[PDB]
Design a protein around this ligand. Structure first.
Ligand SMILES: [Cl-]
Lengths: 96, 97, 82, 83, 97, 96
């Protein structure tokens, strides 16, 4: 499980039917401190995260489960939006 | 998933039955700034992507599910053709140039 | 498995229902000598570890707390105690 | 999946009976530009590829398995391999 | 599998139920020449290894199977205590040395 | 799947009961191509390979299957002994 920032959005009209009508968001991995890994990816989204918001990503077979079921053709899925990250009385990230 | 550009194709007349008669695309990955990275591979495709087009790729067991089932001998599968990619408040790719 | 110190907490009220009734921790890994080793990470936590506590982590999403560490002894010497 | 050239054969008469009726190949991976890329490997083969032939390899009974023999490869407009 | 030296131990009174009451050893891996390499870890143990002793370690899903089943939350498990290691026609470790 | 050379033997009297009475061999992975390298490991063996002989190793869940079943507590198993390796028709390794 990893933290990531939603950097944007991808649009595929012709797509695999098992993606339903869920958003495909451009996500860029970060350290929990907030350090871009350069690592880019596209994550399916059914929670409803917007760009700039920090998200919690699950990959692999859990990414399938998290999206819907084992049938899902996904290897990367957003399972949470971050409200804040604290570090002993200090809020290093907060959602606005 | 990952973004790649269909750079070409592979033709295997003699092939594993679980590949069906689906297409075998040469794909090169794409980076945040919208550019072809170093990384390359071959991905199966029944959606019908063509060379030059950008595609969304799934890998590992998910690719097997995507293509057919765990019977499928694939580690990479195309799950969509990309119409446009908007990142950082800027359109970094669009079909219609 | 790996040792780590809980450096903080990640809050997610809006969350996947499968992840429900779990805590999300910010953790920093501990090197062979009992020192925090820079590389920070995110771990799932259903035991209930607070910041400052040491935790045992299994790698298999990925990081999960599988215990809170009362003490650690190395080559004869205690390198950590609650 | 990955492209590779069959560089040779590994012979094992004494073998696990589950592995029976398969061929063991020595393969070298092929980079984006159609050149052998140094990193050699071992692949299982139940199709039947000889040395010199190019093969398609899936990564996933152990790791590398030949899932086809390559008749030709075209990249950015240009044919980089033909049988 | 891998050879390691039990260098110490970890005590977790509050712990996941699927760890049972098994021991939690600090293990450092060993290299071909018979020496403690850099790599270290914590491994579960119901065989009963003691500090100083060399042990055979299994990792990943195999470790879960080794310890109990896929219910076990472990990525490392001891599967034996090493009496001796003979390599290159030379005894490179023995209990009684 | 990887090539390896059996460099020696390990002896564990007190051992996991799911190892039966099978040999535990010191194995050193073979570089590309012809000689060994740093990578060391211990592989379970039920084929019966001796020291110096080149072996075919399977790891992970297949290593479990190859040894006996999913029950097996092994992450590395020898599934073949090499008779020979031929490059471009040039026997680079042959068994004595
Ligand atoms: Cl392997």
């Amino acid at each position: 499980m990893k933290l990531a920032v939603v950097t944007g959005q991808i649009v595929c009209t012709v797509r695999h039917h098992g993606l339903a009508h869920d958003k495909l968001l451009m996500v860029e991995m970060i350290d929990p401190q907030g350090n871009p890994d350069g690592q880019c990816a596209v994550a399916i989204d059914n929670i409803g995260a917007g760009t700039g918001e920090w998200v919690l990503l699950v990959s692999g077979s859990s990414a399938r489960q998290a999206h819907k079921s084992e049938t899902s053709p996904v290897d990367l899925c957003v399972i949470g939006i971050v409200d804040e990250v604290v570090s002993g009385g200090q809020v290093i990230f907060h959602k606005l």
